[PDB]
């Protein structure tokens, strides 16, 4: 059972600053200890508990791995050979004039993402337009972009880790004290960037959809968390982020950033359903990273 | 030149209605901010409240369900309200200009900033003693 | 609080609790028998009428508290001095903090 509070402030409510008993590394006497879990970690009950209890039997990732995407190349064995298409223009279905043949593919860095592609490869000369069927509004549009849109995120709270013992041997990481401000993650994309890719885009979907159509975006249509937010890790730590503001246009037939709301959050159902649970621990102080947007995921609703 | 006064009582009984004057010369009341501040003898300067045009006003959640300040626009003199004093309220009861700041410590659209006030042109002060 | 610095030398004057988040320090200047004046506002920003040797500890260390450096010291500056803390994570603060009190030797 977790005892929990705001964060101290001067509002709205984000963080938890929650107190619990704990074995220690004896069968015997508990601990009296804090952590300070986000809102999406945690769920009360009519006092709190975590998120996942209610569900899946937890595991806490280990301090020591990085999730820091790697290139990986596939390869095939004897007897067998990957083919490599290599001209400039080809939605991904259908005869290659150019083929050529390797043995392994090029570093294909695995970015778990939602939404915002990241760290991909780059499409040639015009952007890309690929889809499975693209009169059934049921399938997802792949893009690829030529020009890289450039993303920062912050993690701008220099946070504490608490290492309380859950003995013998196994000890779990928590949150202490902030040290700074309040502050949350924010992801920038420059105005000037979005707004020429933006457009790259829909004189392609011009291509398919009528030469004098209006095309329109809007933010997700609801459902799952995973869907609605950009999805991703970046220092260890898993943000959500809120993409109302670079899905909000209208377009016809013819200087600052734009800063996203991210949330976080420590345990983690990866995958849909698979690996159970995963409380990442928390991160010291402030990350930083760039990502490349070089692709998009859109959909479809059932003139304009 | 800027130059404040203070006129009250002086001597006000047990829960009684304060009632004090600020009188103003050299600027108008309604384009700058104005605060009281109480001293006793011996403590640090107790912050009471701040009052301007527009309907800004804010008092001290010490000594809320009592204060009231005023801005009189025809006679330019700012006036304090102390309902219900006892013999803590005894001090010294200055009047000063207020300027206001705005720190900025995050990224200015998440509302990550604060209002910090501070008095820059004081009054010389009244001298306010409660006894039956 | 008092602090005792020779005439000519440097006082430093220990003011507030410690600092949990990025504050704006409003030190002010108390003669006795007369009414507290503004010295530095925004932790060391001097508005006009007071020289650069009054400075502040910046508003931007989190974990020391709001310091008033005050070099070249004179016999003029024998008086009060009380502070502001403006923290963002301690609600507005309405009594200053407790003073301290500068004392010129010989």
């Known amino acids: 059972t977790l005892q929990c509070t705001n964060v101290t402030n001067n509002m709205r409510g984000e963080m938890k600053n929650c107190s619990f008993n704990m074995t220690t590394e004896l069968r015997d006497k508990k601990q009296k200890v804090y952590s300070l879990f986000w809102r999406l970690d945690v769920v009360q009950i009519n006092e709190y508990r975590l998120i996942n209890c209610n569900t899946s039997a937890c595991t806490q990732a280990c301090p020591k791995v990085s999730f820091e995407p790697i290139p990986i190349h596939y390869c095939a064995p004897a007897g067998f050979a990957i083919l490599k298409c290599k001209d400039k223009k080809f939605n991904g279905t259908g005869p290659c004039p150019s083929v050529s043949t390797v043995q392994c593919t090029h570093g294909i860095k695995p970015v778990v993402s939602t939404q915002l592609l990241l760290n991909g490869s780059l499409a040639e000369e015009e952007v890309m337009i690929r889809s499975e069927n693209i009169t059934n509004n049921a399938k997802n549009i792949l893009v690829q972009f030529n020009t890289p849109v450039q993303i920062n995120c912050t993690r701008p709270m220099n946070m504490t880790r608490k290492s309380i013992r859950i003995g013998p041997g196994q000890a779990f990481y928590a949150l202490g004290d902030i040290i700074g401000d309040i502050r949350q993650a924010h992801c920038n994309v420059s105005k000037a960037t979005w707004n020429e890719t933006l457009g790259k885009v829909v004189k392609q979907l011009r291509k398919h959809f009528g030469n004098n159509t209006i095309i329109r975006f809007a933010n997700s249509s609801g459902g799952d968390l995973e869907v609605t937010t950009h999805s991703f890790n970046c220092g260890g730590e898993f943000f959500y982020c809120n993409t109302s503001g670079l899905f909000n246009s209208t377009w016809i037939s013819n200087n600052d950033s734009i800063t996203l709301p991210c949330r976080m959050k420590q345990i983690i159902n990866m995958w849909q359903r698979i690996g159970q649970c995963m409380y990442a621990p928390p991160i010291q102080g402030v990350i930083r990273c760039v990502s490349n947007i070089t692709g998009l995921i859109l959909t479809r609703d059932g003139t304009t | 030149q800027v130059h404040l006064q203070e006129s009250g009582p002086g001597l006000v009984k047990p829960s009684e209605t304060l009632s004090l004057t600020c009188n103003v010369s050299?600027?108008?009341?309604?384009?700058?901010?104005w605060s009281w501040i109480r001293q006793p003898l011996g403590k640090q300067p107790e912050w009471i409240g701040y009052?301007?045009?527009?309907?800004?006003?804010n008092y001290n959640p010490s000594l809320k369900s009592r204060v009231h300040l005023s801005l009189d626009k025809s006679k330019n003199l700012v006036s304090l309200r102390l309902t219900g004093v006892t013999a803590a309220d005894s001090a010294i009861y200055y009047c000063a200009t207020t300027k206001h700041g705005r720190r900025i410590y995050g990224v200015v659209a998440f509302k990550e900033w604060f209002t910090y006030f501070y008095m820059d042109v004081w009054g010389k002060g009244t001298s306010v003693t409660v006894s039956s | 609080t008092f602090v005792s610095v020779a005439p000519g030398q440097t006082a430093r004057i220990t003011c507030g609790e410690e600092?949990?988040?990025?504050?704006?320090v409003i030190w002010y200047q108390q003669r006795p028998g007369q009414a507290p004046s503004l010295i530095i506002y925004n932790n060391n920003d001097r508005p006009s009428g007071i020289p650069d040797r009054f400075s502040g500890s910046p508003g931007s260390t989190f974990g020391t508290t709001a310091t008033l450096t005050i070099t070249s010291v004179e016999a003029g500056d024998e008086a009060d001095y009380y502070c502001?803390?403006?923290?963002?994570?301690?609600?507005?603060?309405?009594?200053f903090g407790e003073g301290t009190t500068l004392i010129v030797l010989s």
């Open positions: 502001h803390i403006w923290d963002s994570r301690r609600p507005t603060n309405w009594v």
């Open positions: 009052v301007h045009d527009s309907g800004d006003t």
């Open positions: 600092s949990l988040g990025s504050r704006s």
């Open positions: 050299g600027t108008l009341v309604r384009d700058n901010y």
